[PDB]
Amino acid sequence: MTSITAIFFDLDGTLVDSSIGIHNAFTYTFKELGVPSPDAKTIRGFMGPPLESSFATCLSKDQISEAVQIYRSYYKAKGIYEAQLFPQIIDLLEELSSSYPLYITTTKDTSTAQDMAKNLEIHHFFDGIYGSSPEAPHKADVIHQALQTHQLAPEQAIIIGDTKFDMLGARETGIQKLAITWGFGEQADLLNYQPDYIAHKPLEVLAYFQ
């Protein structure tokens, strides 16, 4: 804990219960393509991996690009608003932000992440919001960008996240990793990456920093 000076957060599945809008964007896509929708558990599994990778599991390769386009057509206009903070997230942020600069590090596009944080009234708790871009296509690149822009050594940061992508991102960049299990990733997966701390409830996070 003691060397940490900055705290990074994943957005979807960690701060934000975006599941209704993500689910709806997927099912809108399958409706438009005229194909049966996978079940809710399967679609839960699509919350975290790249969109193209998920659609590859259930569509022909020649249809992925069309699927991604249609998905984004629902998500930008509708899905993004079908989202709500997880319980106690405001409490967690108020508490941590009073002792640390906080950053979002997501593979959602920067502008989408900024829009969502402003919509859900949490934008103001952060000193930076970093999403995917040409500079940063994957989780590790986003973390690199956050660290470098804020003149941080990896030893000074920790990511609070709900997926294997967050855990691997942390390992690749040398920052600490705090796994959370109230979100979209499964605890069994997260523990395979040896997190530095784990929480099933937002206020449990706070104890690490005491």
Side-chain angles (χ1 to χ4, degrees), residues 147-189:
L147 289 168
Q148 298 176 18
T149 304
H150 294 285
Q151 290 181 50
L152 297 163
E155 296 73 29
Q156 296 175 265
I158 183 160
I159 187 167
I160 300 188
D162 68 310
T163 73
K164 59 197 277 207
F165 307 93
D166 290 325
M167 303 296 92
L168 285 167
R171 167 174 175 83
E172 278 150 4
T173 53
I175 65 169
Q176 284 185 45
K177 25 171 158 68
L178 195 159
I180 72 88
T181 63
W182 67 73
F184 306 151
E186 312 276 30
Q187 183 169 5
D189 288 301

XYZ file of all heavy atoms in Angstrom, residues 147-189:
331
model
N 0.136 6.277 -16.529
C 1.351 6.385 -15.718
C 2.298 7.469 -16.242
O 2.709 8.373 -15.486
C 2.092 5.050 -15.662
C 1.537 3.860 -14.866
C 2.341 2.658 -15.260
C 1.652 4.126 -13.368
N 2.612 7.392 -17.536
C 3.515 8.358 -18.163
C 2.992 9.798 -18.133
O 3.726 10.706 -17.749
C 3.895 7.903 -19.571
C 4.634 6.573 -19.515
C 4.974 6.007 -20.874
O 4.962 6.715 -21.888
N 5.286 4.716 -20.900
N 1.717 9.997 -18.461
C 1.153 11.345 -18.472
C 1.222 11.995 -17.085
O 1.410 13.205 -16.989
C -0.280 11.382 -19.040
O -0.253 10.798 -20.342
C -0.736 12.810 -19.198
N 1.130 11.175 -16.034
C 1.117 11.676 -14.659
C 2.429 11.471 -13.922
O 2.508 11.663 -12.695
C -0.119 11.179 -13.898
C -1.377 11.742 -14.461
N -1.754 13.051 -14.247
C -2.258 11.233 -15.354
C -2.865 13.297 -14.922
N -3.187 12.211 -15.608
N 3.446 11.088 -14.690
C 4.820 11.008 -14.209
C 4.903 10.057 -13.019
O 5.494 10.392 -12.004
C 5.316 12.405 -13.811
C 5.537 13.332 -14.988
C 6.044 14.706 -14.557
O 7.000 14.832 -13.785
N 5.423 15.743 -15.094
N 4.268 8.890 -13.170
C 4.247 7.850 -12.146
C 5.085 6.663 -12.566
O 4.996 6.207 -13.720
C 2.804 7.353 -11.928
C 1.758 8.331 -11.407
C 0.350 7.784 -11.670
C 1.992 8.533 -9.894
N 5.846 6.133 -11.614
C 6.478 4.803 -11.744
C 5.423 3.743 -11.455
O 4.510 3.986 -10.673
C 7.629 4.656 -10.789
N 5.524 2.580 -12.109
C 4.462 1.579 -11.953
C 4.210 1.184 -10.483
O 3.075 0.913 -10.086
C 4.995 0.392 -12.743
C 5.935 0.966 -13.718
C 6.578 2.117 -13.023
N 5.274 1.209 -9.682
C 5.221 0.867 -8.271
C 4.266 1.773 -7.469
O 3.757 1.385 -6.408
C 6.646 0.910 -7.707
C 7.610 -0.141 -8.333
C 8.080 0.131 -9.801
O 8.183 1.277 -10.269
O 8.373 -0.847 -10.505
N 3.997 2.965 -8.004
C 3.155 3.942 -7.339
C 1.666 3.823 -7.688
O 0.867 4.617 -7.176
C 3.568 5.368 -7.700
C 4.936 5.829 -7.268
C 5.174 7.226 -7.833
O 5.774 7.370 -8.892
N 4.612 8.243 -7.182
N 1.296 2.885 -8.573
C -0.107 2.758 -8.967
C -0.705 1.374 -8.631
O 0.025 0.392 -8.427
C -0.280 3.074 -10.457
N -2.032 1.323 -8.587
C -2.771 0.071 -8.437
C -3.997 0.220 -9.322
O -4.530 1.323 -9.461
C -3.139 -0.216 -6.935
C -3.863 -1.571 -6.756
C -3.943 0.915 -6.296
C -3.773 -2.076 -5.289
N -4.421 -0.865 -9.961
C -5.699 -0.853 -10.699
C -6.737 -1.672 -9.926
O -6.443 -2.781 -9.408
C -5.541 -1.334 -12.163
C -6.852 -1.156 -12.942
C -5.004 -2.805 -12.209
C -6.681 -1.321 -14.457
N -7.931 -1.092 -9.809
C -9.076 -1.738 -9.212
C -9.920 -2.193 -10.392
O -10.395 -1.356 -11.173
C -9.849 -0.717 -8.313
C -8.893 -0.211 -7.202
C -11.211 -1.313 -7.816
C -9.503 0.667 -6.084
N -10.068 -3.507 -10.548
C -10.731 -4.043 -11.735
C -11.407 -5.386 -11.545
O -11.113 -6.099 -10.573
N -12.312 -5.715 -12.476
C -13.152 -6.899 -12.383
C -12.848 -8.020 -13.382
O -13.512 -9.043 -13.328
C -14.649 -6.535 -12.480
C -15.042 -6.015 -13.861
O -14.353 -5.115 -14.378
O -16.024 -6.540 -14.438
N -11.869 -7.844 -14.271
C -11.587 -8.851 -15.312
C -10.132 -9.314 -15.417
O -9.191 -8.632 -14.959
C -11.982 -8.345 -16.731
O -11.046 -7.350 -17.158
C -13.406 -7.788 -16.788
N -9.958 -10.448 -16.105
C -8.635 -10.970 -16.428
C -7.821 -9.951 -17.224
O -6.595 -9.895 -17.105
C -8.763 -12.293 -17.206
C -9.527 -12.160 -18.503
C -9.989 -13.509 -19.049
C -8.876 -14.186 -19.822
N -9.413 -15.115 -20.887
N -8.494 -9.143 -18.044
C -7.784 -8.103 -18.821
C -7.142 -7.036 -17.922
O -6.043 -6.579 -18.193
C -8.721 -7.487 -19.862
C -9.383 -8.514 -20.740
C -10.633 -9.036 -20.409
C -8.751 -8.967 -21.885
C -11.246 -9.998 -21.216
C -9.363 -9.937 -22.710
C -10.594 -10.453 -22.359
N -7.830 -6.675 -16.840
C -7.287 -5.752 -15.839
C -6.105 -6.402 -15.129
O -5.111 -5.759 -14.885
C -8.358 -5.429 -14.779
C -9.494 -4.571 -15.334
O -9.229 -3.705 -16.193
O -10.656 -4.803 -14.958
N -6.238 -7.686 -14.783
C -5.180 -8.367 -14.030
C -3.927 -8.500 -14.899
O -2.815 -8.234 -14.438
C -5.630 -9.765 -13.572
C -6.888 -9.812 -12.713
S -6.679 -8.905 -10.973
C -7.342 -7.035 -11.451
N -4.110 -8.903 -16.153
C -2.971 -9.059 -17.074
C -2.351 -7.701 -17.412
O -1.133 -7.578 -17.506
C -3.396 -9.756 -18.362
C -3.635 -11.265 -18.279
C -4.338 -11.737 -19.524
C -2.325 -12.005 -18.073
N -3.195 -6.689 -17.611
C -2.711 -5.319 -17.802
C -1.793 -4.872 -16.674
O -0.735 -4.265 -16.919
N -2.181 -5.166 -15.434
C -1.385 -4.806 -14.275
C -0.051 -5.534 -14.299
O 0.987 -4.953 -13.988
C -2.125 -5.117 -12.970
N -0.084 -6.807 -14.685
C 1.139 -7.607 -14.632
C 2.099 -7.111 -15.707
O 3.303 -6.958 -15.470
C 0.835 -9.097 -14.815
C 2.110 -9.889 -15.077
C 1.918 -11.385 -15.128
N 3.190 -11.995 -15.509
C 4.183 -12.256 -14.659
N 4.047 -12.004 -13.363
N 5.306 -12.800 -15.105
N 1.563 -6.863 -16.896
C 2.369 -6.339 -18.016
C 3.060 -5.003 -17.733
O 4.159 -4.748 -18.225
C 1.508 -6.216 -19.264
C 1.375 -7.542 -20.008
C 0.066 -7.698 -20.756
O -0.737 -6.738 -20.764
O -0.175 -8.802 -21.323
N 2.427 -4.158 -16.930
C 2.906 -2.789 -16.728
C 3.635 -2.643 -15.397
O 4.270 -1.627 -15.138
C 1.731 -1.788 -16.747
O 0.742 -2.218 -15.812
C 1.116 -1.695 -18.126
N 3.549 -3.662 -14.548
C 4.184 -3.598 -13.234
C 3.431 -2.860 -12.122
O 4.002 -2.561 -11.077
N 2.149 -2.563 -12.322
C 1.398 -1.895 -11.236
C 0.726 -2.968 -10.380
O 0.612 -4.129 -10.797
C 0.336 -0.881 -11.762
C -0.768 -1.607 -12.538
C 0.991 0.214 -12.661
C -1.984 -0.738 -12.855
N 0.273 -2.598 -9.190
C -0.422 -3.570 -8.358
C -1.847 -3.795 -8.913
O -2.342 -3.007 -9.721
C -0.482 -3.095 -6.924
C 0.846 -3.240 -6.140
C 0.668 -2.865 -4.701
O -0.307 -3.274 -4.064
N 1.587 -2.059 -4.175
N -2.479 -4.885 -8.481
C -3.813 -5.278 -8.973
C -4.696 -5.630 -7.795
O -4.310 -6.428 -6.919
C -3.745 -6.434 -10.000
C -2.500 -7.332 -9.884
C -2.596 -8.577 -10.770
C -1.233 -9.182 -11.079
N -0.564 -9.796 -9.872
N -5.866 -4.994 -7.775
C -6.875 -5.234 -6.763
C -8.125 -5.780 -7.459
O -8.798 -5.053 -8.228
C -7.198 -3.937 -6.022
C -7.981 -4.066 -4.695
C -7.761 -2.824 -3.857
C -9.465 -4.354 -4.876
N -8.415 -7.059 -7.219
C -9.541 -7.727 -7.886
C -10.850 -7.424 -7.167
O -10.912 -7.479 -5.944
C -9.331 -9.268 -7.942
N -11.900 -7.152 -7.935
C -13.229 -6.976 -7.345
C -14.191 -7.984 -7.948
O -14.072 -8.337 -9.130
C -13.748 -5.515 -7.445
C -14.149 -5.127 -8.896
C -12.727 -4.556 -6.745
C -15.631 -5.466 -9.251
N -15.126 -8.472 -7.132
C -15.947 -9.609 -7.546
C -17.443 -9.293 -7.613
O -18.252 -10.209 -7.817
C -15.727 -10.827 -6.612
O -16.159 -10.478 -5.296
C -14.249 -11.220 -6.546
N -17.806 -8.020 -7.406
C -19.210 -7.569 -7.517
C -19.589 -7.295 -8.977
O -20.738 -6.917 -9.274
C -19.477 -6.323 -6.649
C -18.768 -5.070 -7.090
C -19.062 -4.293 -8.186
C -17.669 -4.431 -6.428
N -18.204 -3.214 -8.244
C -17.331 -3.281 -7.188
C -16.926 -4.725 -5.278
C -16.276 -2.431 -6.841
C -15.872 -3.874 -4.930
C -15.560 -2.739 -5.703
N -18.623 -7.471 -9.875
C -18.776 -7.068 -11.277
C -18.913 -8.217 -12.250
O -19.531 -9.247 -11.936
N -18.321 -8.050 -13.425
C -18.631 -8.935 -14.549
C -17.721 -10.153 -14.652
O -18.181 -11.220 -15.060
C -18.732 -8.147 -15.873
C -19.709 -6.990 -15.819
C -19.514 -5.865 -16.611
C -20.837 -7.043 -14.994
C -20.417 -4.801 -16.576
C -21.739 -5.980 -14.939
C -21.519 -4.852 -15.722
N -16.460 -10.012 -14.240
C -15.531 -11.127 -14.258
C -15.782 -12.073 -13.098
O -16.306 -11.662 -12.049
N -15.400 -13.334 -13.284
C -15.599 -14.377 -12.274
C -14.388 -14.474 -11.335
O -13.248 -14.412 -11.788
C -15.841 -15.732 -12.945
C -16.884 -15.713 -14.076
C -18.314 -15.848 -13.586
O -18.624 -15.415 -12.452
O -19.135 -16.412 -14.342
N -14.652 -14.653 -10.040
C -13.605 -14.670 -9.008
C -12.520 -15.714 -9.275
O -11.340 -15.450 -9.060
C -14.224 -14.870 -7.613
C -13.230 -14.840 -6.449
C -13.909 -14.782 -5.082
O -15.142 -14.851 -4.983
N -13.111 -14.649 -4.023
N -12.940 -16.896 -9.734
C -12.032 -17.998 -10.073
C -10.943 -17.566 -11.053
O -9.762 -17.880 -10.841
C -12.813 -19.191 -10.624
N -11.344 -16.841 -12.103
C -10.417 -16.293 -13.094
C -9.466 -15.282 -12.440
O -8.238 -15.370 -12.595
C -11.183 -15.617 -14.240
C -11.881 -16.607 -15.166
O -11.188 -17.468 -15.761
O -13.123 -16.507 -15.327
